[PDB]
Design an enzyme around this catalytic site. Structure first.
Site, PDB file in Angstrom:
ATOM      1  N   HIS A 196       0.829  -1.201   0.000  1.00 26.08           N
ATOM      2  CA  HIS A 196       0.000   0.000   0.000  1.00 26.08           C
ATOM      3  C   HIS A 196       0.868   1.258   0.000  1.00 26.08           C
ATOM      4  O   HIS A 196       0.676   2.156  -0.828  1.00 26.08           O
ATOM      5  CB  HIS A 196      -0.953  -0.001   1.204  1.00 26.08           C
ATOM      6  CG  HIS A 196      -1.796   1.230   1.317  1.00 26.08           C
ATOM      7  ND1 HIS A 196      -3.145   1.241   1.034  1.00 26.08           N
ATOM      8  CD2 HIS A 196      -1.484   2.491   1.700  1.00 26.08           C
ATOM      9  CE1 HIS A 196      -3.623   2.459   1.223  1.00 26.08           C
ATOM     10  NE2 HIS A 196      -2.633   3.240   1.617  1.00 26.08           N
ATOM     11  N   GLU A 197       1.847   1.331   0.898  1.00 31.85           N
ATOM     12  CA  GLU A 197       2.655   2.545   0.999  1.00 31.85           C
ATOM     13  C   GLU A 197       3.593   2.698  -0.196  1.00 31.85           C
ATOM     14  O   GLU A 197       3.820   3.814  -0.685  1.00 31.85           O
ATOM     15  CB  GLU A 197       3.462   2.558   2.296  1.00 31.85           C
ATOM     16  CG  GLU A 197       2.648   2.440   3.581  1.00 31.85           C
ATOM     17  CD  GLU A 197       1.565   3.483   3.737  1.00 31.85           C
ATOM     18  OE1 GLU A 197       1.577   4.506   3.026  1.00 31.85           O
ATOM     19  OE2 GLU A 197       0.696   3.278   4.613  1.00 31.85           O
TER      20      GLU A 197
ATOM     21  N   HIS B 213       1.854   4.268  -3.054  1.00 26.97           N
ATOM     22  CA  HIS B 213       1.826   5.727  -3.014  1.00 26.97           C
ATOM     23  C   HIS B 213       3.072   6.319  -3.678  1.00 26.97           C
ATOM     24  O   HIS B 213       2.990   7.325  -4.388  1.00 26.97           O
ATOM     25  CB  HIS B 213       1.738   6.263  -1.586  1.00 26.97           C
ATOM     26  CG  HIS B 213       0.387   6.148  -0.957  1.00 26.97           C
ATOM     27  ND1 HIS B 213      -0.770   6.553  -1.579  1.00 26.97           N
ATOM     28  CD2 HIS B 213       0.022   5.710   0.269  1.00 26.97           C
ATOM     29  CE1 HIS B 213      -1.796   6.351  -0.768  1.00 26.97           C
ATOM     30  NE2 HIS B 213      -1.342   5.849   0.364  1.00 26.97           N
TER      31      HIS B 213
ATOM     32  N   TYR C 247     -12.925   6.442   3.528  1.00 27.46           N
ATOM     33  CA  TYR C 247     -11.508   6.698   3.324  1.00 27.46           C
ATOM     34  C   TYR C 247     -11.103   6.312   1.905  1.00 27.46           C
ATOM     35  O   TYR C 247     -10.828   7.179   1.071  1.00 27.46           O
ATOM     36  CB  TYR C 247     -10.692   5.947   4.368  1.00 27.46           C
ATOM     37  CG  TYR C 247      -9.221   6.270   4.351  1.00 27.46           C
ATOM     38  CD1 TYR C 247      -8.764   7.491   4.818  1.00 27.46           C
ATOM     39  CD2 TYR C 247      -8.293   5.341   3.923  1.00 27.46           C
ATOM     40  CE1 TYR C 247      -7.422   7.792   4.824  1.00 27.46           C
ATOM     41  CE2 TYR C 247      -6.947   5.629   3.927  1.00 27.46           C
ATOM     42  CZ  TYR C 247      -6.519   6.855   4.382  1.00 27.46           C
ATOM     43  OH  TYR C 247      -5.180   7.137   4.396  1.00 27.46           O
TER      44      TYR C 247
ATOM     45  N   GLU D 277      -5.870   6.964  -2.167  1.00 24.67           N
ATOM     46  CA  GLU D 277      -5.913   5.833  -1.243  1.00 24.67           C
ATOM     47  C   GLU D 277      -6.523   4.616  -1.922  1.00 24.67           C
ATOM     48  O   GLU D 277      -6.041   3.496  -1.769  1.00 24.67           O
ATOM     49  CB  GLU D 277      -6.685   6.208   0.030  1.00 24.67           C
ATOM     50  CG  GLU D 277      -6.044   7.335   0.804  1.00 24.67           C
ATOM     51  CD  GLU D 277      -4.644   6.995   1.295  1.00 24.67           C
ATOM     52  OE1 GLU D 277      -4.328   5.783   1.418  1.00 24.67           O
ATOM     53  OE2 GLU D 277      -3.876   7.940   1.562  1.00 24.67           O
TER      54      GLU D 277
HETATM   55 ZN   LIG Z   1      -2.509   5.249   1.910  1.00 22.06          ZN
END
Ligand SMILES: [Zn+2]
Length: 195
Positions: free
Chosen positions: A117-118, A121, A153, A160
Site C-alpha cells: 500500500h505505501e 503511493h 476513506y 488511497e
Molecule cells: Zn494510503
C-alpha cells in the site's frame, strides 16, 4: 508470480530497500522484501532510477530522526482516538518508511498489506506522476472506489483507493482475483499500466 522473476525483483529491491540499524526480525524483513518483489519489475526499476529508498524500521515511525517532526501529531480523522503518528506503522509518497512486523491488516493500519500500500503511493507519485489524480482514474474511482470497503476513506480519496487496489493487485493470487471481481475497471487499468 514465477520464482525466477521474484529473485530478479529482489535483486532490484536490494538497491531500494534500506535495513535499519536497530534489531528486528530478519526473517520478517525478508518476507516484506519478498512481498514487494511481486510488484512489476518496471515499477521497481523506476523507483531505483529515482533513488527512492524503502526504509524498513525497527521501531516507531516517529523514533526515526527524519520523521521525528511527526511526534505527537494527530493524523487527519484520528481525533479522539488517543492515537498519533507515533502509532502509525508506515507512510508512502515522496519517501517510504515501514515498521517491520506490521505488514498485515490491523497492525496499526487498515491496508491489506502495509508495504505494498505505501510503496504504491510512492509509485503513484514518483513513477506515475500522480496518476491516481488523473481524469481517467477519477472516472474509475467514481464507480468502483467504494468496492474494497472503508468507504469513508478509500471511497473518498482516489490516491488511497489507488494504493489499496495496487496492493490487492500485487499481494497474492487471492487478492488479485478479488480485485478483478470487485473492481474490474480498476483491475484492467492496472493490468494495462504494467504492459
Ligand atoms: Zn494510503
Amino acid at each position: 508470480m514465477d520464482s525466477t522473476t521474484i529473485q530478479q525483483n529482489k535483486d532490484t529491491l536490494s538497491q531500494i530497500v534500506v535495513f535499519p540499524t536497530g534489531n528486528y526480525d530478519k526473517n520478517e524483513a525478508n518476507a516484506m522484501v519478498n512481498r514487494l518483489a511481486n510488484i512489476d519489475g518496471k515499477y521497481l526499476n523506476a523507483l531505483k532510477q529515482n533513488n527512492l529508498k524503502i526504509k524498513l524500521l525497527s521501531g516507531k515511525l516517529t523514533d526515526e530522526k527524519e520523521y521525528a517532526y511527526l511526534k505527537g501529531v494527530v493524523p487527519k480523522g484520528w481525533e479522539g482516538t488517543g492515537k498519533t503518528w507515533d502509532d502509525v506503522p508506515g507512510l508512502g509518497g515522496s519517501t517510504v518508511a515501514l515498521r517491520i512486523g506490521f505488514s498485515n491488516k490491523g497492525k496499526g493500519h487498515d491496508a491489506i498489506n502495509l508495504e505494498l500500500h505505501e510503496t504504491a503511493h510512492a509509485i503513484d507519485h514518483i513513477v506515475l506522476n500522480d496518476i491516481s489524480k488523473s481524469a481517467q482514474f477519477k472516472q474509475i474511482f467514481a464507480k468502483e472506489g467504494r468496492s474494497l470497503g472503508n468507504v469513508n476513506y478509500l471511497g473518498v480519496y482516489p490516491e488511497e483507493f489507488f494504493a489499496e487496489s495496487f496492493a490487492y493487485y500485487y499481494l497474492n493470487q487471492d487478492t488479485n482475483s478479488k480485485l478483478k471481481s470487485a473492481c474490474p475497471q480498476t483491475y484492467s487499468f492496472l493490468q494495462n499500466l504494467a504492459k
